[PDB]
Amino acid sequence: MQVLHVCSEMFPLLKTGGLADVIGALPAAQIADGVDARVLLPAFPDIRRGVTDAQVVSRRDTFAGHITLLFGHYNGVGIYLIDAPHLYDRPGSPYHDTNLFAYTDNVLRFALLGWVGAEMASGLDPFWRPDVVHAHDWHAGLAPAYLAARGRPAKSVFTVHNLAYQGMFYAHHMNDIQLPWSFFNIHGLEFNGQISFLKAGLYYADHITAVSPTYAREITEPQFAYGMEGLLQQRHREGRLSGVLNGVDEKIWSPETDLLLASRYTRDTLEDKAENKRQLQIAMGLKVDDKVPLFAVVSRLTSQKGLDLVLEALPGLLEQGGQLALLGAGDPVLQEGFLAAAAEYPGQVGVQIGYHEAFSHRIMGGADVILVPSRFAPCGLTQLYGLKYGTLPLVRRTGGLADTVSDCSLENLADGVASGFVFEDSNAWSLLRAIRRAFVLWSRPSLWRFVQRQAMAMDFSWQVAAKSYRELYYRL
Ligand SMILES: Nc1ncnc2c1ncn2[C@@H]1O[C@H](COP(=O)(O)OP(=O)(O)O)[C@@H](O)[C@H]1O
Ligand SMILES: O=S(=O)(O)C[C@H](O)CN1CCN(CCO)CC1
Ligand SMILES: OC[C@H]1O[C@H](O)[C@H](O)[C@@H](O)[C@@H]1O
């Protein structure tokens, strides 16, 4: 079984969010579980520079101009790169320019991604051809469309990491992407009178997965599907929709071995976490106090993630004696809002606007609670990281958050399954109740410790995930 992942990011080479973490860890897990998995990425600068053994496989002309297909390895996994400098040789985000504007040629940049994914199924690489093309999110959404147009020389799965990103392009671009014009149909990649790459992936794939069992349910609903629910309901009925929960990469996210930490620690030596908290408080200008709960945010600052709710609840949190350590970027209103709170409440509110990989680890290893009040959450990796680091996740019950966190209810505590705090509704009052629950648990140190150790006992294994994907690939 040979599988090609088609995607736009991969940790540690290029990352804007959780998708990169997944691509950086799944393929190796699949190889251990007996599937020959390879990865296809655009040759973005940071990616090309990481793959130092990359060699030329072939050269082609395409509707978007020439590509050189390269192939190398990273961390033992086979990596293909689409070198097409006129499309991909630009710094920063795969998706937008430095002024945050989508590239005007995005339609070509990502259509080509899909095209090369499909072409691989027809011998683009004379030495290796995938049995399954595994496309991720809209970026790779055309892979299954090109495959369908070519008579399906390989089977395909399309994995939804997030349905809110639809890859919408004007219909006239049908002229530019070398697909049958008959594909521009509601039974095809048309969506509200435009081309949707997401629609294309959902429609043409042999099978669709989502990154958690609950999200796979949710996206058959209008409030999570944003118009796509009819296709997904039909695919569910056809048995062509399923959920497979993400793992966590233990090479990167383990307090036991995390080299980015002032102090490493384990489920049975949580006293060794204290130094991380102390240094986190110092680094952020917080009062150095071990009697007070430190709440953490590592997140995009947006409504999708519920960070407006955090801002609204902040006074309530401060009033009860908690601290906040926040790292993130997003809505300028929220950025400014949080900077204002840090200025207004120095010593209890520490804020850092921007993206900092290493600092996220120091927050994860030092905070007591991580706030993940997502409005929707296909998976929510930061919360799985919280569990592993014994920093209790405080989450809204939606998507993967609902699959993985157990509220500190009486029965969960009694059954020894409690592992964090869960609230229900997307408002500050609802959030504030969970926050109060955390203060109540904090006032009982031995119960807190009990819950920390259960949080750290939870396991999210990529090789277990690989086994589900394998079963799926063989059913296709
Ligand atoms: N400002 C930031 N600094 C460092 N890492 C961040 C920042 N914002 C998000 N991340 C990281 O991005 C990933 C987000 O994954 P996840 O929580 O599943 O959300 P999503 O898939 O929507 O990006 C996590 O690794 C998280 O730690
Ligand atoms: O907004 S864009 O469509 O231009 C950019 C992408 O959709 C960015 N992503 C990456 C993957 N995501 C979810 C999986 O981590 C968030 C959307
Ligand atoms: O965060 C970026 C945005 O992405 C999507 O468009 C969501 O619909 C929105 O809620 C979110 O804030």
Helix (H), strand (E), coil (C) string for 94-107: CCECCCCCECCCHH
Antiparallel, parallel or unpaired: β 194-196 and 190-191: antiparallel
| Bridging pattern class, strands 168-169 and 55-60 | unpaired
- The CA distance from 386 to 93, in Å, is 27
Of 240, 263, 244, 260, whose CA–CA distance to 252 is shortest?
Answer: 260
Task: Answer whether 327 contacts ligand 1 (Cβ < 6 A).
Answer: yes
Find the 312 Cα to ligand 3 centroid distance in Å.
19
CA distance 150 to 145: 9
Single out the residue of 458, 467, 452, 459 nearest to residue 421, CA to CA: 452
Statement to judge: residues 208 and 262 lie in one domain: no
Q: Which residues contact 397 (CB under 8 A, 6 or more apart)?
A: 422, 423, 424
| Diameter of the chain measured on Cα atoms | 66
Q: 68 has which bridge partners?
A: 59, 83
Residue 148: CATH number of its domain: 3.40.50.2000
Residue of 358, 353, 349 lying closest to 294 (CA atoms): 349
Residues 294 and 436 both lie in one domain: yes
Q: Which is it for strands 421-423 and 2-6: parallel, antiparallel or unpaired?
A: unpaired
Q: What three-state secondary structure class fits 277?
A: helix
> With a 6 A CB cut-off, is 302 part of the ligand 3 pocket?
yes
CA angle 19, 51, 91 (to 5 degrees): 65
3-state secondary structure of 32: helix
Question: Which helix or strand (DSSP H or E) is residue 184 part of?
Answer: none
Contact 260, 361 (CB under 8 A): yes
Asked whether 379 lines ligand 1 (CB < 6 A), one says yes
273 and 405: one domain? yes
Residue 167 vs residues 194, 210, 375: alpha-carbon distances, Å: 10, 17, 21
- Bridge partners, 372 (sequence order): 395
CA of 119 to the centre of ligand 3 (A): 32
Residue 15 annotated as part of some ligand binding site: yes
Beta strands in 312-420 (DSSP E): 323-328, 349-353, 369-372, 392-396
Ligand 3, atom nearest to 300 Cα: 1
Which of 219, 303, 335, 376 is the best mutation target for the ligand 3 pocket, counting ligand atoms within 8 Å of the beta carbon and taking the most? Answer: 303
Both 108 and 225 in one domain: the answer is: yes
**Using CA of residue 97, residue 165, residue 168, residue 177, what is the dihedral sign?**
positive
Residue 72 has φ and ψ, to the nearest 5°, of -150, -160
Q: What angle (nearest 5°) sits at the alpha carbon of residue 94, between those of residues 90 and 96?
A: 85
Specify whether 244 is located in the same domain as 256. no
Same domain, yes or no: 262 and 397 = yes
Residue owning the nearest CA to atom 7 of ligand 2: 165
CA atoms within 13 A on the CB side of 404: 36
User: In whole angstroms, what is the distance from residue 367 CA to residue 365 CA?
Assistant: 6
**36-42/2-6 β-pairing:** parallel
Query: Which residues are registered as beta bridge partners of 190?
Result: 195
Using CA atoms, how far apart are residues 200 and 188, in angstroms rounded to an integer?
A: 6
Side chain identity at residue 435, one-letter code: I
Return the HEC string of 12-30. CCECCCHHHHHHCCHHHHH
The protein residue whose alpha carbon is closest to atom 9 in ligand 3 is 304
> Parallel, antiparallel, or unpaired: how do β-strands 369-372 and 349-353 relate?
unpaired
* Preceding peptide of 12 cis, ω within 30°: yes
Burial of 105 (0-12, 13-18, 19+ CB in 10 A): middle
Residue with tokens 């530019």: 176
CB neighbour list of residue 376: distance below 8 Å, 6 or more residues apart: 164, 218, 224, 304, 398, 399
Ligand 2 pocket by Cβ (under 6 Å): 16-19, 95, 102, 137, 161-162, 165
Instruction: Answer yes or no: are the C-beta atoms of 132 and 6 closer than 8 Å.
Output: no
Nearest atom (ligand 3) to Cα of 375: 10
Pairing of strands 421-423, 349-353: unpaired
Instruction: Give the DSSP letter of residue 162.
Output: -
Whether the CB of 426 sits within 6 Å of ligand 3:
no
For residue 139, what are the domain limits?
1-248+459-476
Q: Is 295 helix (H, G, I), strand (E, B) or coil?
A: strand
Are the C-beta atoms of residues 51 and 80 closer than 8 Å to each other? Answer: no
Q: Which protein residue has the closest C-alpha to ligand 3 atom 11? A: 304
Return the DSSP state at 263. Answer: S
* Ramachandran class of 329: left when φ > 0, alpha when ψ lies in -120 to 50, beta otherwise: beta
Element spanning 193, H or E: none
Query: Which atom of ligand 3 is closest in space to residue 303's alpha carbon?
Result: 12
Q: Rounded to an integer, what distance in angstroms lies between the CA atom of residue 395 and that of residue 213?
A: 17
Are the C-beta atoms of residues 206 and 156 closer than 8 Å to each other?
yes
Query: 383 C-alpha to center of ligand 1: Å?
Result: 10
SS3 category, 137:
coil
Binding site membership of 381 for ligand 1 (Cβ less than 6 Å)? yes
Same domain, 274 and 231: no
Q: Residue 64 gets which letter from DSSP?
A: T
Ligand 3: does its nearest atom lie under 6 Å from the Cβ of 164?
A: yes
Q: Are 389 and 365 in contact (CB under 8 A)?
A: yes
Three-class secondary structure of residue 340 per DSSP: helix
What number does the ligand 2 atom closest to the CA of 106 have? Answer: 4
Grouping H, G, I as helix, E, B as strand and the rest as coil, residue 454 is helix
Identify the three-state secondary structure at position 464: helix
Tokens 């009990």 appear where?
Answer: 450
Query: Is the CB of 17 inside a 6 Å radius of any atom of ligand 1?
Result: yes
Helix axes 307-319, 428-442, angle to 10 degrees: 40
Q: DSSP 3-state helix, strand, coil percentages of the chain (rounded to 5)?
A: 40, 20, 40
In ligand 2, the atom with minimum distance to the C-alpha of 166 is 3
Strand partners, 37: 3
From 266, 373, 375, 423, select the one nearest 383 (Cα to Cα).
Answer: 373
Query: Do 20 and 63 lie in a common domain?
Result: yes
**Distance from C-alpha of 304 to C-alpha of 289, rounded to nearest angstrom:** 32
What is d(CA 72, CA 99) in angstroms, rounded to the nearest whole number? 32
Q: What is the Å distance from ligand 3's center to 304 Cα? A: 5
CA 298 to ligand 1 center in whole angstroms = 7
Q: How many domains does the chain have?
A: 2
- Ligand 1 and 153: CB distance under 6 A: no
- Whether the CB-CB separation of 53 and 72 falls below 8 Å is answered with yes
Give me the residues paired with residue 160 across strands.
210
From the CA of 172, how far away is ligand 2's center (Å)?
Answer: 24
- Output the CA torsion sign for 103, 327, 21, 162: negative
For residues 466 and 414, state if they share a domain. Answer: no
Nearest-CA neighbor of 312 among 299, 321, 303, 304? 303
Which structure tokens are listed for 234?
A: 């039909």
Q: Which residues of 407-435 are buried (b: 16+ CB within 10 A; e: fewer)?
A: bbeeebbeeebbbbbbbeebebebbbbbb
Q: Which residue has the tokens 């599907």?
A: 225
- Nearest ligand to the CA of 304 is 3
Burial 20-51 (b: 16+ CB within 10 A, else e): bbbbbbbbbbbbebebebbbbbbbbebbbebb
Ligand 2 atom closest to residue 161's alpha carbon, by position in its atom list: 14
> Ligand 3, residues 168, 304, 375: which to mutate, most atoms within 8 A of Cβ?
304
Per-residue buried b or exposed e for 112-122, using 16+ beta carbons within 10 Å of the residue's own CB:
bbbbbbbbbbe
Please check whether residues 255 and 240 belong to one and the same domain: no
Determine contact, residues 125/148, Cβ cutoff 8 Å. Answer: no
Find where tokens 């071995």 sit: 257
**CB of residue 304 inside a 6 A radius of ligand 3:** yes
d(CA 368, CA 390) in angstroms, rounded, equals: 8
Strands 207-210 and 241-243, sheet pairing = parallel
Q: In sequence order, what are the residues at sequence separation of 6 or more whose Cβ sits closer than 8 angstroms to the Cβ of residue 183? A: 145, 149, 174, 189, 200
| Residue 112, CA atoms < 13 Å, CB-side half-sphere | 27
Asked if residue 396 and residue 346 are part of one domain, the reply reads yes
Please, which residues have CB within 8 angstroms of residue 226's CB and are 6 or more apart in sequence?
163, 164, 166
Nearest to 84, CA basis, from 103, 98, 72, 70: 70
Which of 268, 91, 301, 118 lies closest to 205, judged by CA?
118
Q: What is each CA distance from 155 to 26, 135, 429, in whole angstroms? A: 19, 11, 48
Name 328's bridge partners.
353
Atom of ligand 3 nearest to the CA of 226: 8
Please tell me whether residues 96 and 233 are part of one structural domain. Answer: yes
Distance 193 CA to ligand 1 centre (A): 33
Nearest protein CA to atom 3 of ligand 3, as residue: 304
